């Protein structure tokens, strides 16, 4: 089906305390495969999935070299942005970049992205046509000019439509067993009363991959999501994910309160009634 | 595989 590769980079300044912390992470769908952390032992790009370990030493040197180039740009960016916004040297600030590409079921290019943030809000972004930029404010307008004269969108479009998809396809065949598996959720339903006036009903989806899932509650046909407590999908730690949905329910209608589960590892979607 | 031309903001 549809597949994606993203890289995520975070760089945080440490005023009075030397170089910024730099963390880069690579994913294919919801599966991590590479990391770099500037506080770690190796000082290299490191594998995080078994199917990427089979790359030879030139991959490992190149990626290490390039992630070092990235740390540097972000290092200088923290200094540059602090200048653009006239902030003091006393505070810590955060730079974030995310880039990558989506492919469809036939594995051809669908979409490419390259987003940049300062202090947790949008700074500059590559538009969907991979030709043009959205700048968040007047300070980011300076970067936009700088990158138009550096032909950055042209350089990124070449990567996002070529290299990025070429390399994702390589990862998806190398990682076939892992990356093209689909884990259906092991489902499960629990009752917890409070004081014999109400009852919480909790629907569970455990052990699923990929992370995308929909849980909806429903009072016999019409959906009851004006009561539902829905936690964030959380990692189990073994490559799979967990999520739960709950309604506070009067003592009698638990028969006619149904829980609806949607995940792509299921052929037909699941219905859960309390029994 | 990472992008090869990151450029300063």
């Amino acid at each position, epitope marked *: 089906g549809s597949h994606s590769m993203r890289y995520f980079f975070t760089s945080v300044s440490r005023p009075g305390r030397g170089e910024p912390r730099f963390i880069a992470v690579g994913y294919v769908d919801d599966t991590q495969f590479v990391r770099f952390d500037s506080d770690a032992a190796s000082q290299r790009m490191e594998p995080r999935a078994p199917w990427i370990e089979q790359e030879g030493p030139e*991959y490992w040197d190149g990626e290490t070299r390039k992630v070092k*180039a990235h740390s540097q740009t972000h290092r200088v960016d923290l200094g540059t942005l602090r200048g653009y916004y006239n902030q003091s040297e006393a505070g810590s600030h955060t730079v974030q970049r995310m880039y990558g590409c989506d492919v469809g079921s036939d594995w051809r290019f669908l979409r490419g992205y390259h987003q940049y943030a300062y202090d947790g809000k949008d700074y500059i972004a590559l538009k969907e046509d991979l030709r043009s930029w959205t700048a968040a404010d007047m300070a980011a307008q300076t970067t936009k000019h700088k990158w138009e004269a*550096a032909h950055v969108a042209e*350089q990124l479009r*070449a990567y996002l439509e070529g290299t990025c998809v070429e390399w994702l396809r390589r990862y998806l065949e190398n990682g076939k067993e892992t990356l093209q598996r689909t884990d259906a959720p092991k489902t499960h339903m629990t009752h917890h009363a409070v004081s014999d006036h109400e009852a919480t009903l909790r629907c569970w989806a455990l052990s699923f991959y990929p992370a995308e899932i929909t849980l909806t509650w429903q009072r016999d046909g019409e959906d009851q999501t004006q009561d539902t407590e829905l936690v964030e999908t959380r990692p189990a730690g073994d490559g799979t994910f967990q999520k739960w949905a709950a309604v506070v329910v009067p003592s009698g209608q638990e028969q006619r309160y149904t829980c609806h589960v949607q995940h792509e590892g299921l052929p037909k979607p699941l219905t859960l009634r309390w029994e | 595989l990472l992008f090869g031309k990151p450029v300063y903001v």
Partner: T-cell receptor
Amino acid sequence: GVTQTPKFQVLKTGQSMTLQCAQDMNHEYMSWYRQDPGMGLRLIHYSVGAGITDQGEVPNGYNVSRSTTEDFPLRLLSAAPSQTSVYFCASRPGLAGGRPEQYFGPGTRLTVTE
Amino acid sequence: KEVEQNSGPLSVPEGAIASLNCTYSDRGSQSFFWYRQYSGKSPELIMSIYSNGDKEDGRFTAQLNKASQYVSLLIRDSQPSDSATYLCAVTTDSWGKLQFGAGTQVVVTP
């Protein structure tokens, strides 16, 4: 673009010489090549930013520095006949902006005789 | 041999096609360049290619095939002032060495 100095040089065995190279474009990455008929371009020393240099495949007898981003001199302390070559300075943005391309200096023919 | 070029020299008469080929070894190469050097002067940049397929500019067409690791340069409708040696250049990143081939010399016959 890239300018380099001088265009031609004669030296005897043992003399010292510096080749200048200057660059207009805020390029971080500057490099020094020698070109020879048997073996194309060979990288002597390079620098990915001011203050900072490292060696190529043929660094021996050559000595380099980079206090400013604009300039990247290549020094020979004691010339040998094997240093008879055409030397090219080159520069390239690195992490800086502008056109993502490497450009060359016009070259210095050097000959070393006994 | 990191970057391998076409033997040389290449005689083509004026008006004809000079076809140049080039091979690299690094899978992760992302940038591809053709340089032109007349005898006694410096390599001048003439083509950059970044994506698979053709890039036409004037009488030069570049071609890149990253699966077979192949870079190509065609010179349509040759002239005596195309007589030079043509350098293929390939790199992976911002900080990687630009790898030059030994060059193929093209001689354009009047």
